[PDB]
């Protein structure tokens, strides 16, 4: 009667490999898609003008990092990178087929307030999706990325259920599209760190989140076979004085996930979400001494990937060898992370 | 804690008193909002070759009736009308609002398959919309359509749970952007008739959607006494033999909708969806003898106002006095119609 | 394909042609089912043993009272008394017979905490509920009521999800189960009014848990058309200094039921909720000064009704006719409020 | 704000650990909870009368074979044997301590049609359940089981949206309940045979039920950590000539687990549904040699432990060691079966 259509055996085998690959032991994310505009803040930090040339320059120093496929499985870019060259004019794609990394794009259109919510977040991007995966596996991305947004706020009652309802359908929506049009969806629900909430109501958020997440996959027909989940850990609020030890961190994100995620899922790659580049690091590794686990848990980070890169290229070019060695640092920090053998740099129901 | 945040009680005014004004007793709605595309199976039917020209020229006709106001209230524009001009330089807004007839605008973007269903419609648009109705209200328009699609076939459980769930988010989110910038909304949930299906099949289906429209309205803080309704009637397949008398079509629509909207909602403004001109009207007319009722029950037709018009028309322009004659004619039977007064022309629980 | 199946037309039009009699104009019911316990409270406001004997002879006080069916449809009675005889030796029933009025049953089994909330209520009773409406409908029965709680606590974000989801479903397994059984369910869903929340609050709770419960009786094929509800009016919260005023009190009711009540459902009997006997008065009456309304606006009243009858009465006999005297000054009362006709004794979106 | 309050450590560490020693390796569940009437259909199979001394002498043949705990965790029992002695005199309960296998107790009160459905069915037994699982406590169960009942019938549109709605509905409410009284909760969605349909039929309903059941466990607050599963294989119908390869079974029956089973339940424990004895136990094995799981897959069996059994038996007395023999060698089969090692007796998306 009215069940999903079956899908594809051919579109879901190649999903179901290529969110393997993506999801490799040892390896993770590059998340490398800010906008045009997000990208103008990490310049910023370093006093750098948001010229195309600087932007590719950049990107450019990223994906041409000698063995960075080592430790990277997959990057996501923006749409201005997927068609970008480097200034040596390379596509930034052959950069990465070079290393065997798999590109992705972010294809979400950014967020807009729900009416008559407290500034509660819809994702907008459904229209046309269909039609940009089409042109966007043409060019080579094997995968997508989604973000939604919520925040915690108990005297505020956020998220509320519009909220929670609003992100589920969206993200349910665009992983259907992403794998009627063979991209692998990355499903972002981000709980913000915002407040001074404790690390137990971020855990209580997140489980409801996620029961809500999946279900609406499943409502939409969603293979898990052939996507990711990329959710914050759970943590303490960025206003609270300490942050939350990484066994504490750990032991609650592990909880969340699989009080609420079914095993078929082949990844989870989290994002750092406003960590250190050692706590980022810490945090995953020491989820993966507790493993083995159902799913790779793994990364997926723009930041705790970044942040030292860009402090060290400063916008100066001769440095551009200095900046890849860092982020070879911490490409190798978080790969080994993912096994639970990262050694430092720099039951509760 | 986290209820919707109250709506602007000037905001609020506006949109009740606009929608009120739209389901005037007496009056309803002139559909002229067919598409490019769809415009050409009208132009086709009496051999005109779509020009821009020849729209202008066809709208101008419709609009510029002398009289129309009297039972015409509101009249949905295509976007390309809203900004159009007639073929004497007068905008067609201009036109209406001679008329007393408030503009209003289609906003969808049409439809697009939900993945993995049997054919079933997402209908899109979401995206840019705010902004939209932003611009659409300082061109004059005051209210607003978005069109969904759903079909029954017992054999394919059609319409599946996915399909509901998809068309009551879209008019949701749909109907609170546009209030929130002062455009009254049009909730059109359209079932159509295609199938063998009994008039009884039709009630159920009727019901279990609006019963599914309505509480996600609800859900997404929607001002119902600010909205409009725009279903079908209930009525036979269009395959079935015989069609459903006026007297088992006014009774079945009626109580679908006492079964489910909520009396706050100030109209129901039905779509004619394929009936005769004189069929449209009479099954309207039956429903307001069996009046008073909890809504204004009314009019928001094409077809059913302008298929005569056109075939009186037939491109030629010297005969445009005959065609919008034939448009008075079937304005004034659907106005009296909703006053339970048209003389004809051309419980079960 | 899975749809309900239709309801038997006999026993639909005896449901319906009883809950029109119930919500007959210018009349309401007596709410006298206080079970054993709750009797015991009323009759230690007055110094009476809760006897059988004494139980017996007041609920004789009350139906025995001459031109009752004046102003009262139906009684609502606890089981004890529906197999009860008067001191006299006259079944309850043939009393309530005498004066036409229709014998209620209670039906539900009390309250118990849903696990792992801050004290919210399911209300429990759907174990044999079938057998017991068929042995109620034989014994003379022909309506039930099931009482569902709910609390407003901002703070404590009361009433949750879980609370409502519970109300609901409990309201619509006992609607359709009294259905099947020939029996009127009246739907109880209370809000109670502790706190100091404002009369917007109640009105934004009132709307979510109603939009709720209808969703569901739809959901379970419930026949509005043969069913009665039982709401609390919308006031401020019993901690508040200041009582709303009537006419506010009637606005923001009215509005709330106009918001989420389809006007198939043929009546609206309200609880009291502590209200004194002047106020329920006052305020049905300023609802009905509002008129006409899609549906019946009356009352369903225990304490509003029995108040001044227990004090007069005292538990000494001989002063039956003095209770009887006041019991019919309030009924009289409430039965002209209904009308929007009584004179006193004693748009915001 | 309007969370679950956090379930006490103390009540969850022994719902948990209680749990996995259900669901320990090697061993599973004895279901031996047939009603008093279930029972009469066993007896009479192999002509014998069912009086309480012949339950009482097969459930002690039972209970009392020497080294069942070996392969046997837990038992299920009627009301009727967890309260009785054997015929010498021991308490059942007492055998079952004797051989360490944990006492468990059916606390469901059977099947109720929905009204207005076509025979599907409600289970019930809410009221009254907090209470009876206290005692059960008190009298040494220390796990519930709870049987909801689901058919597959295409034509129909079985089971529908309101079948599904009310089995989650129940098994939630119950589960939450048997753990606020230190009971593990055993959730059986049973989607039975009936029918002719294919295995990838079964697969899909078992995912919709399955993920509607665990939406609901979360919403109501259940500890995954401390409840079981005890769900259909996913087969064939039983109206189909050939049954499904046990590869073939157990692939579809691990896929739909897998895409729908958080995996911080401990243990998935099959019913056996009318299998024979050794299909039940191959299709087991099949599903181990798949391994290692996220959970625990493992045996709930009446029928498939106990068949030959009864015909051993034949209610003569002497051939007790004859019929006890049988029971272990089946019991050792299943226990194998757990671990992948039974050597036989007697991917698609
Ligand atoms: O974490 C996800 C990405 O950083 C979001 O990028 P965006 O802010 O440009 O949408
Ligand atoms: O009934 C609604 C309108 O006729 C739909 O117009 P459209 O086909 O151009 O979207
Ligand atoms: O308002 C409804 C009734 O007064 C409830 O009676 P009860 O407290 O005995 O359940
Ligand atoms: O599979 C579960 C049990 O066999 C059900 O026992 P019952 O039929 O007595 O409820």
Request: with cysteine.
């Amino acid at each position: 009667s009215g069940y999903g259509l079956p899908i594809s055996q051919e579109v879901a085998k190649e999903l179901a490999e290529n969110a393997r690959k993506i999801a490799a032991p040892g390896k993770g994310i590059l998340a490398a898609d800010e906008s045009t505009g997000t990208i103008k803040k990490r310049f910023d930090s370093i006093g750098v003008e948001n010229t195309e040339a600087n932007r590719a320059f950049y990107r450019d120093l990223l994906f041409s990092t000698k063995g960075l496929g080592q430790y990277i499985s997959g990057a996501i870019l923006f749409e201005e990178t997927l068609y970008q060259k480097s200034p040596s004019g390379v596509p930034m794609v052959d950069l990465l087929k070079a290393e065997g990394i798999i590109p992705g794009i972010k294809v979400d259109k950014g967020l807009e307030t729900l009416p008559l919510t407290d500034d509660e977040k819809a994702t907008m991007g459904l229209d046309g999706l269909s039609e940009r995966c089409k042109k966007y596996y043409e060019a080579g991305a094997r995968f997508a990325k989604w973000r939604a947004v919520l925040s915690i706020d108990p005297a505020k009652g956020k998220p509320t259920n519009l909220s929670i309802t609003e992100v589920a359908h969206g993200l349910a929506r665009y992983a259907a599209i992403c794998q009627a049009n063979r991209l692998v969806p990355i499903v972002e629900p981000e709980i913000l760190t915002d407040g001074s909430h404790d690390i137990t109501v971020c855990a209580e958020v997140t489980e409801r989140v996620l029961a809500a997440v999946f279900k609406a996959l499943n409502d939409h027909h969603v293979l898990l076979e052939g996507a990711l989940l990329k959710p914050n850990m759970v943590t303490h609020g960025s206003d609270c004085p300490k942050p939350a030890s990484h066994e504490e961190i750990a032991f609650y994100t592990v909880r969340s996930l699989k009080r609420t995620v079914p095993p078929a899922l082949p990844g989870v790659m989290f994002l750092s979400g406003g960590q250190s580049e050692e706590d980022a690091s810490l945090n995953l590794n020491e989820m993966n001494k507790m493993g083995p686990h159902p799913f790779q848990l793994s990364f997926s980070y723009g930041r705790a990937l970044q942040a030292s890169c860009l402090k060290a290229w400063k916008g100066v070019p001769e440095n551009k060898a200095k900046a890849q060695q860092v982020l070879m640092e911490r490409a190798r920090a978080n790969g080994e992370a993912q096994l639970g053998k990262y050694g430092g740099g720099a039951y509760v129901y």
